[PDB]
Amino acid sequence: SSVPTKLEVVAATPTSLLISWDAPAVTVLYYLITYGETGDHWSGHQAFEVPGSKSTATISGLKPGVDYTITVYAHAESYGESYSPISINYRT
Amino acid sequence: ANSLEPEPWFFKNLSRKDAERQLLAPGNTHGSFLIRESESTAGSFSLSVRDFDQNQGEVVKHYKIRNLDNGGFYISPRITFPGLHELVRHYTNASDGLCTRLSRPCQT
Ligand SMILES: [Zn+2]
Ligand SMILES: [Zn+2]
Numbered sequence: 631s632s633v634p635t636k637l638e639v640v641a642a643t644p645t646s647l648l649i650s651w652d653a654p655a656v657t658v659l660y661y662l663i664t665y666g667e668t669g670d671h672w673s674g675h676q677a678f679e680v681p682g683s684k685s686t687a688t689i690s691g692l693k694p695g696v697d698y699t700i701t702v703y704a705h706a707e708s709y710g711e712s713y714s715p716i717s718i719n720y721r722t
Numbered sequence: 723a724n725s726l727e728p729e730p731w732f733f734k735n736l737s738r739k740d741a742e743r744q745l746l747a748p749g750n751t752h753g754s755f756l757i758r759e760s761e762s763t764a765g766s767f768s769l770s771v772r773d774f775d776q777n778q779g780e781v782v783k784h785y786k787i788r789n790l791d792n793g794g795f796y797i798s799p800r801i802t803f804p805g806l807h808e809l810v811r812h813y814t815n816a817s818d819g820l821c822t823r824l825s826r827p828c829q830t
Binding site for chain 2: 660662663664672673677679681701703705708709710711712715
């Protein structure tokens with residue numbers, strides 16, 4: 631099972647997405663969120679950090695009509711292994 | 723904390739294309755690697771690695787090392803490291819999602 635759970639888009643424009651997820655019981659210092667066109671190799675994805683107290687994030691600067699894969703990685707320590715990530719797909 | 727200048731795998735102001743010609747110089751093979759600082763934005767690093775051949779041609783891949791707010795670094799969001807030294811030893815033990823295991827600093 632993954633941390634967090636219930637990743638979903640909750641708002642969309644042609645160039646941005648708002649995502650939200652179920653607040654986890656376990657400790658989270660920070661999330662790492664990656665996004666990029668489905669099919670692209672992971673090493674070309676964009677990535678950014680949100681603090682472990684937020685349960686939403688905004689992804690902007692997207693191109694319309696593109697399939698994005700969005701993945702959320704929860705980190706329970708300053709350094710080390712994430713929990714099992716959670717991932718969704720969505721088209722702008 | 724100035725601990726990168728003695729590292730044999732660290733190359734100060736080295737461009738992506740100079741990293742490729744450096745890693746394609748004689749004496750390197752798959753696993754040969756370097757970390758370089760970006761020439762424009764100080765503090766942002768890349769990992770360049772000599773890959774497995776493709777279609778009898780030599781290959782060099784590049785990975786952005788990304789910066790944590792807490793000062794650490796990561797390539798894959800699945801594992802984060804307190805500095806470049808731990809990042810390098812981790813990917814020297816296993817490829818763990820990189821094209822190839824880091825095996826030898828780039829030979830000059
Ligand atoms: Zn729902
Ligand atoms: Zn693409």
